[PDB]
Symmetry: D2
Subunit: 301 residues, 4 copies
């Protein structure tokens, strides 16, 4: 019997108390660090995938192949951490949304989210978004739900709406209701603009687990994880938890290297140290375990 | 016709006053950030490829597919900037050394490096490394040379040897010699153990450009670029330039997130901020030029 | 001094007397076979690709990754042989049409066609098609011409319209001329319905090279290369010239393997014969010239 | 729960009565065709993958990435039909054999085979084969077996040796044995020189279910389905069963296209027909059921 984190994430979002905290990772390393810090959930950012795999802004540039491989490898770094993964708008219509679902399920991906934008989608905290009508939107969600059923996957279907910005509060809620009716599992109102409004969605969709996108310095005012739990939310996501820090530091680092002529990393950061963050030691156990002798001796010095 | 940065680097390699300084990057973000900071050349670390793409240590886990893809994107962020891309051992015998060359060429890679380890390779600063003999190795260096000139490519072939730690300085120099005769453009003594030895290679192989691999806190004492230039090297790489610092900053930041429950990114790090680092302005022009409406009134909130 | 069939074909189309016959190929095998036949050009069918890569119909399930990979590899079987690569609707808006143009050009592709359906397009001989408005289409062509030009590519842009069935003859022509004005290299009126439309269109955009798509037993009367040349076409393609016969042959061989329980391939299908169809001899030479003893001996017996 | 055709097959293999007939497919077309002919199992040929995905010979060109992708798409067309996928040598040492085992399980691959060649392998019917040593090889086998249990897959680890051409019959059987020992489920003596040795090897490795690779016009004399069943094989594969014919038919099609200046395909082959061979109807039902109307009025021309 093979296992997926969809299952125990699914049980937790059925327990009305357990609260899910998920930092936003974008590649192998951010995922290894966020694990070491002791988080019990990860979020694979679409934006961060764009950044790292393409060097590109969050503009629909990422392909299903792109997202799925990244989502996959992030999922099996630790197969019991549920991974919540971006899936943008489904990489097409029903035919495509199902492949994405099927794919993300086989991959061990614990949840994903489908938004209501046109396929050449935009970061949610960006102006001038373009949406698809409610009918097409429900059709994506209904495909993802029917797709998981057919293969018996527990993968958690998260319905994002980007419509607040363009269409007003009332309409985004009509969309979330309509996604709840097609069988979605969690509701995702993107870019909540106020505490009044976080409070107001939660009651308007009372008893449906909702998710908060705590992207900072965008449309959404700062809510700590505790306050969100307390407000009623069931999941909070921090898409730039890794990406932000990593940018500031590399920048300073490259400017330092520029004036200086050598990086000057702390003497702690040895290649073995750096490798250990990426599972060196577990990787050599695997070799010694199967009769191999390549890491005979260790690996220092 | 189409241009590649092979020809600049190969040209610059001929003027013996030009000295190529290339920091390590390992994904799009590090790349854009290295570029933003004014570097004239980039080095894509294999180790860093393994870590960001796979979350794995540097042990030959990366496939040609992984490597090339990552090489092409990094190379095309800024087409006029030369990129020296790790090619491990050529991912096979000659047949593969050859596809490796052609594909890196087509990708717009400016230079690459092939070493004398078994395919199932390992970072050069760990104990244990297992090598192939001199003939096989030369076969690889010859395969790259032949495949480049067969397609009319100016990509720069860097001959590396990982054989100092087990076979001794003398052998290491003998393999560089063979390689030089086989037509490599640049010598790569991995894991130079002293300044004595740095000055010494340069002399024993005088006339022939050499790379210094400036990985700190490993086998090589800390030599700055200015100093390497003065010794007589032609290229200096720093594989962990972005990676060390990103690992530190993210570890920090994830620890903060865990205690704090909100990441607290500096206010300067809006979503737009971060996309703008990843070419958002330019992506927005392509559209407008083409001329699209998507982006109309930009994206600011 | 890297080179590309794109430029060879650019030139062909500059002289109106040149006539181009390009059979459909969909994978490495079809490609080798068609090359062995002596054909001077290839057409990588999108439909085709979907069937081999995915085991799926032509419904817009291939992503850019799929199509670029296939196109590149086909293109580099015989680098001197121009390959006309299907490129669907460009895999998104302008941003993606450039990435498509850039990648295809780096891959050695000679030409590609962009059409005017929605991104979840279907084969042009199915009913139903859904189209985007003319402006949105022109925006695509325009991005490919621009993208071409920013990078100095000679790649041929082929403007397709699927508008005949839904909008009729004259809207079709209107769209085509609109694309010509945007810098497109070749017109492509999908599923022309009569031999006199054939001739009407050729004088309707006279001076401008036109492609005939000779897919049989859908929408288009059966017209030959001789006949097409005479009519005044510049390029004739046959998406299923390899595909169909392969299907039918495999169908019959699977029944016969069904009943008889041993395939009974002809005495000449040895493994080695099959391999020589795919460059065994040439890639054994690659090795030797390097050279290892890998195939030292030969491979036979 | 998601269900793997690897279980249905593990269990089929405990039945001493179940004989598995598996034709070699290599792309989606050749999968879809094999299925409709009614086969209950498919074989992904390593060789055929090289040819179709790369245009290249069977020489170690394919990377794990390559092979997994084909193996995955091929398993999931009919997800209840077991797919036995080539795995070459496992693309490196344990670490890599582990990843291969893992990815092939997630993909739905029913079985995969691992050989004792150098990682730059060649078709086991070419000369020149250069092997690795027994220890090294058991390390590979033991790793796919440990990887498999670490994650709880039913995936069937087939053990293959190429050592017959190079090191003789008795060494060939020593290797195959060392490997039953490290936990492999199915044995694969590749390139059987004669029919009395096909009879012999079953005897020598009684207890353990074996696979015949029936590649025609190489080293192995031609032995049929019922005939290998009788002798006592559990699995027979025909790696070129899709690819031989396709080559012959395409060569002819090209000659005809020069002769006639048009393929002259049969009235039967409408685009629709070929598409339906590729599951177009299934595809269109997925859209309708999800509420999409993209295929309203259907898709046959009017
Ligand atoms: O992380 C993401 O990709 C995202 O979709 O959640 C987002 F943050 F960019 C967003 O659009 O909000
Ligand atoms: O960065 C690399 O991949 C490298 O090869 O330069 C190295 F640093 F890992 C090394 O092997 O020294
Ligand atoms: O081969 C193709 O992909 C094609 O676009 O030309 C076609 F045949 F499918 C078609 O749409 O005519
Ligand atoms: O199909 C294959 O790749 C194969 O391994 O079975 C073979 F036929 F090439 C072989 O090695 O015999
Ligand atoms: Mn996103
Ligand atoms: Mn390296
Ligand atoms: Mn097409
Ligand atoms: Mn094989």
């Amino acid at each position: 019997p093979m296992v997926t984190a969809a299952t125990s994430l699914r049980r937790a979002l059925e327990n009305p108390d357990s609260f899910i905290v998920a930092p936003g990772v974008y590649d192998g390393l951010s995922a290894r660090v966020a694990l070491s810090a002791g988080f019990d959930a990860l979020y694979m950012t679409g934006a961060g995938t764009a950044a790292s795999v393409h060097g590109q802004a969050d503009l629909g540039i990422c392909t299903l192949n792109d997202m799925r491989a990244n989502a996959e490898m992030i999922s099996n770094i630790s197969p019991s951490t549920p991974v919540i993964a971006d899936a943008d708008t489904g990489y097409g219509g029903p035919i495509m949304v199902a492949r994405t679902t099927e794919q993300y399920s086989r991959s061990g991906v614990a949840a994903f989210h489908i938004e209501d934008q046109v396929q050449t989608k935009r970061c949610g905290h960006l102006a001038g978004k373009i949406l698809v009508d409610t009918d097409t939107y429900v059709t994506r969600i209904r495909a993802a739900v029917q797709a998981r059923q057919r293969i018996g996957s527990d993968i958690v279907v998260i319905a994002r709406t980007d419509s607040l910005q363009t269409h007003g509060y009332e309409e985004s809620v009509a969309r979330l209701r309509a996604a709840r009716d097609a069988g979605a599992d969690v509701g995702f109102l993107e870019g909540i603009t106020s505490r009044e409004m976080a409070r107001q969605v939660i009651q308007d969709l009372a008893g449906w687990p909702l998710l908060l996108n705590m992207v900072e310095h965008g449309a959404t005012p700062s809510i700590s994880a505790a306050e969100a739990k307390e407000m009623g939310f069931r999941i909070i996501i921090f898409p730039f938890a890794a990406l932000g820090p990593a940018v500031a530091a590399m920048r300073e680092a490259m400017e330092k290297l520029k004036r200086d002529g050598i990086p000057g990393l702390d003497k702690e950061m040895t290649p073995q140290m750096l490798f250990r963050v990426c599972g060196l030691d577990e990787s050599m156990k695997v070799d010694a375990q199967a009769g191999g002798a390549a890491f005979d001796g260790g690996v220092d010095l």
